[PDB]
Symmetry: C6
Subunit: 63 residues, 6 copies
């Protein structure tokens, strides 16, 4: 509900994000796509991140 | 839900800053922007999207 | 089902509790209120604790 | 559910003490008081309410 | 869906398994039984392992 | 689901090896055998059953 427009705003302007995982690890890249359960984060290769493993998605700059 | 919603709404309405402690121990701080069943948007320079499943406690900086 | 009467017993007698989180952290206070997903723990300020982050709720004394 | 319920019931019925290991590695020990879909009540001086989501394993001190 | 036949294959041949938990801990034994939420792992005593706490179930040898 | 399924299927179909990073930080590596709503079967000597709830990220060794 809030997830969709939040992630869409980031994707359409190709705003880089930091995705902090529940274990502290920080991933970085651009939101390429997503569904109910995963976010596809783009960089060199596209990695599929499970939302359940994410603590916070942080834009690098205001959107 | 029936306690979570009025609790968050009261903090947001009076712009009371909060500390959001995550399951990994990291403390986030900011203003409550909005929330749904799954996430809380926490703002200050940017609005970051915090998954509720990753939060342990939400602590106001002062009583409601 | 068991949660409600367990938490209500603690609340009505204002019995102090320790809430141990899944990361080891111990919170302390009195059960002020709760719903399906959170417990409001009272002390100096009221903090909202997600049940999913709790490992065990331990009364300080028999109820 | 169909295995969890008879397993816990057998331990409780014969008052077999258990060790409940939590996801964080802490070991709780006691007697099974009762349980529902979400929690197990573990007793000895007090009854503590243990969320199942936080438990990794329940280990009897002896075979059923 | 995949869980059932995977676990049944291990059980019927009594193939020993290692069950790695989400905290890193490695349990070992034989799959005795399971339901929707737990796996009963047999060894000296039978211990009930919650699936939500498991990261991976690894056969000791090909099945 | 609608992104997860085509993503995993593409990797499996071309036999592209993956690294599966778990929430605890352990890295598993192998070939995707199959998956359902709850688990991914990861193969090489044995097929191991990996619970999705325990995975943080699935990373291909090369673009799809």
């Amino acid at each position: 509900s809030l997830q969709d427009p939040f992630l869409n705003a980031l994707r359409r302007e190709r705003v880089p994000v930091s995705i902090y995982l529940v274990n502290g690890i920080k991933l970085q890249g651009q939101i390429e796509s997503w569904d109910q359960f995963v976010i596809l984060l783009k960089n060199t290769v596209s990695q599929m991140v499970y939302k359940h493993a994410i603590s916070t998605v942080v834009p690098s700059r205001p959107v």
